[model samples]
Target: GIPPLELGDCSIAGWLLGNPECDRLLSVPEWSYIMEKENPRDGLCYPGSFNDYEELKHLLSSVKHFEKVKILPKDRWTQHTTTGGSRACAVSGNPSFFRNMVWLTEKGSNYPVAKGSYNNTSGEQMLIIWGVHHPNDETEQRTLYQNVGTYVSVGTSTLNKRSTPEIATRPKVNGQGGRMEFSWTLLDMWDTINFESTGNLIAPEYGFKISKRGSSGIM
Candidate 1:
């Protein structure tokens, strides 16, 4: 069963908010009624804030194994669904950055594919990059394609034949009963999408005079 919050918890919130005025304001019965009405959790008035040193220490200690990664999920073109929802890859290292890399999985699919560029000494492990499409729309055929930006090699992993640049950071996880559970890691710029009107433009073709152009200008 979950533990219940008490007056101690309220005191903790007062300290964490760093506003004695708030604490005083909260003492009113009306404030209590409002807080109870607007409780974020369905069954709890409020979770205790980490104001006391011991409580703060307890919070940090309980989550030492968790790490956060940020991912950016748009293409340079800013097209939606260009990359499939939520992709997974095999990664290694400090869970802070992708240093040594390995295989990446298909977008929306958990299956792993071998890449020649990223190789991890610890062997292949699963990593999920947050906040982006799994397979961004960076194709290999176009060099001058501004949509496909230059690849930034944070570290070498196995070679990815699919052609999109691999991210350069590792994810953090905690282990329990021989299974590893990952903490959220923020993966920034996972997808690079530009949505501005200036970024969107249809080119006009001058070939074969105006009469030869397609009816809708969509050749």
Candidate 2:
């Protein structure tokens, strides 16, 4: 299991919060435990994190693998994210052709998709949109880690996909919808959903069809 993080009394989190007089700080093991719990792809502890160049290195850094690619890992041990936020990733070293990328994740952990945001690797700006869980609407019951993770991306030739913009930088918002978001990261957002099993996509108009879909998958 994990060690307990006993803070006598400090309502505040993060040093940047500008809260001093606060001494009951977060511990290293506690921090690492949280990391190991949330970011499965980054093993910073026992069994320890697999080398960045191991089977993991390619999965994370390689782009050729995900072009027109879609998959749900055999297990959820290698993927975790939260603000508890978010990746299975895609890269566009060049935006001339591959202007936009897609991801459809499946449910594994059933946590809330609270913090959904993005990043631009090419120094370009980025933005993402959210849709109600199409086949399902678990945004309301985020704690169950049930329901689906919803995300959408749009770009232009001027920005041309923004060179692998980060589709998810935080937890999949609870669909709870609020500013004081709780920390979280969901299990899957890169698989081709299971409509029969859960029912789900690869593209908006070309990938998956509701007439034939699973729980929820990314495109």
Candidate 3:
């Protein structure tokens, strides 16, 4: 559904772009605190331009596509431009970005990153605007993989003779270390904290516990 026009008191162009006469001016995103930067280095798209974050965010938020992407489980993928090579998506193909990312507004102010909201996909805590496709760029590219999860090894198999299964050196955390945390004590003692499935930590020896999700603790 096109969701009713949330006309924040203005004309169509003004509402979508910004209302100059109303003194309420800023793009739809900026107006609602959902904004981006302009420099390609900063990854904000300039009206028609794009960067990975913007493109990825656009794809996840939308339901339809032209070179429309549809998937689940054994998912298929898409990468096409309808209008021209400069444009990246079909009309209405992208998902609704603000719906998932802007949950904090309803709670009235800056709040904890809400769980189950789009912002909390539970994966991807950090991102590097990396990867290069050019001459003399190869050596620099592999360094980015120093702290990574599992990666593929890209080379032609002895029998395959194709540019194949290519990749890098580490896991998402860079090493294999499942979690059992610890801390030192002043005396000749230490505390080993055990975590529940939900990650509520309990240091039985110290009579302390950490609550789920939220701030504050009990000791």
Candidate 4:
């Protein structure tokens, strides 16, 4: 609600027409125009010349009417005022923007994940790994297909991180029957790399094996 005292013009106009101390403030032309501006329908009953009780009633009525004016939504108001009635200028509502795009992920080599090395592993990655897609043939039943290829890496590691030992460990033959092994190291710690698979696999999927060594007492 708008405070009546803070509505400077309306309040001043109301006061000037109401009080004897301020009666001299109104010349005939100004008084007549001011009253017309306030109560154009009835200048004779202008609130400024009324007793406190009557003036309160008039102010209440004016404020009530003013409050009835609708406030447009934020986007609409922005477009209306700044873009000259062009709604197209407003920012588009994108789900990604609100849910994921505001603050960027930390500078790192890895994607955020719950229990594995990848980000959105269970949720988003599961869709990619097992989700069914329409078959190319119109007559065939659509079935789930496992597509695999050389993995290209992406993240901050591409820019600034040191080359990890894993780079040398990449298999020469990918399971996709492709001889080529795609690999890249982050030039710096702050850089990112994006790993994407290119095709389907035809050979056995090789799994990772880890081993370690430590120094022993020498003779």
Q: Largest lDDT belongs to which candidate?
A: 2
lDDT by residue for model 1 (1-219), tens: 122222232332232221222233322211111111222221111111121334432332222121111112223222221221111111232222111111121233222121111121222121221111112223411211233232211221322111233223233222101111111111122222111111111111000001111111100
The TM-score obtained by model 2 is 0.17
Model 1 error, position 204 (Å): 36
Q: Return whichever of 2 and 3 wins on lDDT.
A: 2
The full ranking of all candidates by lDDT, starting with the best, is 2, 1, 4, 3
Model 1: how far residue 5 lies from native, Å:
30
Candidate 2 or 1, higher lDDT: 2
- Against the true structure, candidate 3 has what lDDT? 0.18
lDDT of 4 by residue, 1-219 (tens): 121122222333223222222333232111101122343322211111222434433433332111110111123211111111111111243111111001111112222211112222111101000001112232211111122112222333222211111112222221111121112221222222222211111110111111111222111
Clashes per model (N, Cα, C within 3 A): 41, 44, 15, 22
Residue-level lDDT for 21 in candidate 1: 22
Tell me the spans in candidate 2 whose CA falls farther than 4 Å from its real position.
1-109, 112-132, 136-219
TM-score against truth, every candidate: 0.15, 0.17, 0.16, 0.14
Q: List RMSD in Å for every model shown.
A: 23.7, 20.2, 23.0, 32.9
Which has the greatest TM-score?
2
Single out the weakest 10-residue window by summed lDDT for candidate 2: 42-51
Instruction: Please give the range of 10 consecutive residues that has the lowest summed lDDT in model 1.
Output: 202-211
Model 3 residue 62 lDDT score: 28
Give the alpha-carbon lDDT of every model. Answer: 0.20, 0.21, 0.18, 0.19
TM-score of 3: 0.16
